[PDB]
């Protein structure tokens, strides 16, 4: 029937930022629109998240930073302070009337890529260090030269005991101790370590065996040029005389994955560790770590730190040893997004031959499906969001955009908690990533799939 043609804009189209600066990007509707405006982020291989609806509303769980207003037809989007979490595609979107329509985007570039934090920690760097400390009483010092690729997360190192030696002790429960600048930090992550150079940190540890066996440990860590520089302090005591340390039964550290977080305005990390031990059991230990910058740093969020450490080669007493250590930083949950606790997963995307038919359906869980309306939105290979369908909570009034309208039908089972779409005649336009979400009375799409693929293609 006669509707509205609501073209939304926005402005600019990409731009190129830094961390700290304030970003506005604003749209405009052709023929006023109210209030009822939202905005998402968008960021690379994820769903959209909703931000902000009626222009200036904030969804639960978004940071102050983030910001909105407008009325009529002109709106604005304002971050005041650029973290690195930010850098996504944003779009915005009508709900005064259907068809829905989004914004074509606006893309936010890293200006400069990682140029200003590369003069200072270098892709390769050196390691010089010294660790002096006693084990059961046992009074030594090993010092160690090494080579590594912070950016990737690795680095080996070259360790030998100049007094003490022949140690006492197994050699494993001290190699944790030879730096977390060494661990390769995705984009959306704030890298705590690197930020810290050239001044440094240093981190405080306590390692507490399950036979009760204690170790503390404390490093300063400093830089000058390419060349890290480590004075470590060790110490250990109540190693039982035939424990697997005392009698050297360790074989190697399992890999680990140790959880970061902040309090007290610094960064700690646990981690449960696990000695392999000839014959095959496990000797546990929990580390707690405290990692301090000496100047004020980018706090990040809650992640995870995978970390896998092993001795590549030693003598018979381990005067003499190689040792290497690879780690890498990522969140744990686990593309898709919400602003509470209902999670949808889409299925059937697939392969089809132009006229084909194909059927998408996603399944709810974790709210009560039948109590809200719900929508498929698509996005074509580089291109923006695209409203596609809706239907009320019941099921029984639908709307469609005109691209599928008399092609596509959207339906519902709510005893099963899922939503269909069903696509006839598909042509090469329809080939996208199909998402499910969740439509709020606000305006706002507030839970969507990670979406699934849709691919028209002949001989």
């Known amino acids: 029937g006669a509707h509205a043609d609501i073209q939304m804009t926005q402005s600019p189209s990409f731009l190129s930022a830094s961390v700290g600066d304030r970003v506005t990007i604003t749209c405009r509707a052709s023929?006023?629109?109210?209030?009822?405006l939202a905005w998402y982020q968008q960021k690379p291989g994820k769903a959209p998240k909703l931000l902000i609806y009626?222009?200036?509303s904030l969804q639960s769980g978004v940071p102050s930073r983030f910001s909105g207003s407008g009325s009529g037809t002109d709106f604005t989007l304002t971050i005041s302070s650029l973290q690195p979490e930010d850098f996504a595609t944003y779009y915005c979107?009508?709900?005064?009337?259907?068809?829905?329509?989004f914004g074509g985007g606006t893309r936010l570039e890293i200006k400069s890529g990682g140029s200003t934090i590369t003069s200072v920690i270098k892709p390769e760097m050196k390691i010089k260090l010294r660790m002096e400390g006693a084990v059961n009483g046992h009074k030594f010092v090993i010092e160690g030269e090494g080579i590594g690729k912070p950016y990737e997360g690795t680095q080996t190192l070259d360790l030998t005991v100049e007094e003490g030696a022949p140690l006492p002790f197994s050699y494993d429960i001290l190699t944790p101790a030879f730096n977390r600048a060494f661990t390769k930090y995705p984009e959306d992550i704030p890298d705590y370590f690197k930020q810290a150079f050239p001044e440094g940190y240093s981190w405080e540890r306590s390692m507490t065996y399950e036979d009760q066996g204690i170790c503390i440990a404390t490093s300063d860590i400093t830089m000058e040029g390419d060349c890290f520089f480590y004075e470590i302090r060790f110490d250990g005591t109540n190693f039982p005389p035939n424990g697997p340390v005392m009698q050297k039964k360790t074989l190697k550290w399992e890999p680990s994955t140790e959880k970061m977080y902040v309090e007290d305005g610094v960064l700690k990390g646990d981690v449960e560790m696990a000695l392999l031990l000839e014959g095959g059991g496990h000797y546990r230990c929990d580390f707690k770590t405290t990692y301090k910058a000496k100047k004020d740093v980018r706090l990040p969020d809650a992640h995870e730190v995978d970390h896998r450490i092993e001795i590549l080669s030693h003598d018979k007493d381990y005067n003499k040893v190689r040792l290497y250590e690879h780690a890498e930083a990522r969140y744990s949950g686990g593309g898709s997004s919400s602003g509470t606790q209902v999670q949808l997963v889409e299925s059937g995307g697939g392969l089809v031959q132009p006229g084909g038919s194909l059927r998408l359906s996603c399944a709810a869980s974790?709210?009560?499906?039948?109590?809200?309306?719900m929508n498929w939105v698509r996005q074509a290979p580089g291109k923006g969001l695209e409203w596609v369908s809706s239907?009320?909570?019941?099921?029984?009034?639908?709307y469609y955009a005109d691209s599928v309208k008399g092609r596509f039908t959207i339906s519902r089972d709510n005893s099963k908690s899922t939503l269909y779409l069903q696509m006839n005649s598909l042509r090469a336009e329809d080939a996208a990533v199909y998402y499910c979400?969740?439509?709020?009375?606000?305006?706002?799409?507030?839970?969507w799939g990670p979406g699934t693929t849709v691919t028209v293609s002949s001989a």
């Open positions: 974790g709210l009560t499906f039948s109590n809200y309306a």
């Open positions: 239907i009320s909570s019941r099921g029984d009034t639908t």
């Open positions: 979107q009508q709900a005064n009337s259907f068809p829905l329509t």
């Open positions: 009626a222009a200036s």
């Open positions: 979400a969740r439509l709020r009375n606000s305006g706002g799409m507030d839970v």
């Open positions: 023929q006023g629109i109210s209030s009822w």
